[PDB]
């Protein structure tokens, strides 16, 4: 069954709620981002309307198969009426396509659900500024202090530094990057672009980035592995197994792989600075693990959650201990004290 925080109160509407069946009232199911845990449920067979942004349109049509009279594309930052009600889509900072949701309820009452999200001063001089928020239905994934990693832009000039200085001393090495899901292109597009290579990949993934409306990207990546210095690879296949089974597969082209795991936080994070992080090696294979992150970090939420300013907060994530619920109760009354709404 459904659960609360899933549902918009007075109107017809779910969030992110495609595994539960005919969700009883529900005339309308809105999708955040094409992240499985979100998605999950979703195939060619449903038959009620989806509405989202338009590249989640793009995957849910091409990867899913759904079919194009279900989906309901609308564009950002534009006031929209869906069944009656005003909605507005806000870019969350997180995968390409990731959105926000602010529903104008017609007793007066707004609602902004974060979806998945990096908060971001930016935020503050979106339509955000405009009116009050009375309920927010928040990404709380990492709502504790000890959850801090540095910028996208620090990490991402540590892998072109790392990337560029390597390949530079061996012109016959590889770089390899690891993905399962979308998000984080960043990271293997700045690597090709130092290194002057495409991107190679296999079928199936050059298909979703073709989903993507990424400004030139046929110019940055391709099919043709062998004509290619930077290789994607599933995340699974990051580690020293599967990268010596990877480098048997070039034909002795290479002669060692540089390899990078974007992992969300990892506790190194309380210890190590960014500058100071090193790779797991064996014979001529080196492993990175970077620290690159597209939700927010707990300082980033707390400064947004401030200036938003809430009547109540609705966690959507960690909410299945009664420990991690108490724990992110006690940090929204501090927040609330401490700025005085
Ligand atoms: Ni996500």
Redesign the pocket.
Known sequence: TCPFYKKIPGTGFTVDAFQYGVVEGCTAYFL??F?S??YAGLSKHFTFPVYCSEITGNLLKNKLHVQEQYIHPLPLDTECIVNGVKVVLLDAN??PG?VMILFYLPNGTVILHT??FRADPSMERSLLADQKVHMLYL?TTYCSPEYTFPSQQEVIRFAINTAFEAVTLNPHALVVCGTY?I?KEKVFLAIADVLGSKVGMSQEKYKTLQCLNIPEINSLITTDMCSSLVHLLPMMQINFKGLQSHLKKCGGKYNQILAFRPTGWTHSNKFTRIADVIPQTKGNISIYGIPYS??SSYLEMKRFVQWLKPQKIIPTVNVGTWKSRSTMEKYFREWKLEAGY
């Open positions: 955040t981002h992240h845990d979100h997180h995968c990731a979806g998945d990404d899901s998000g597209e939700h």
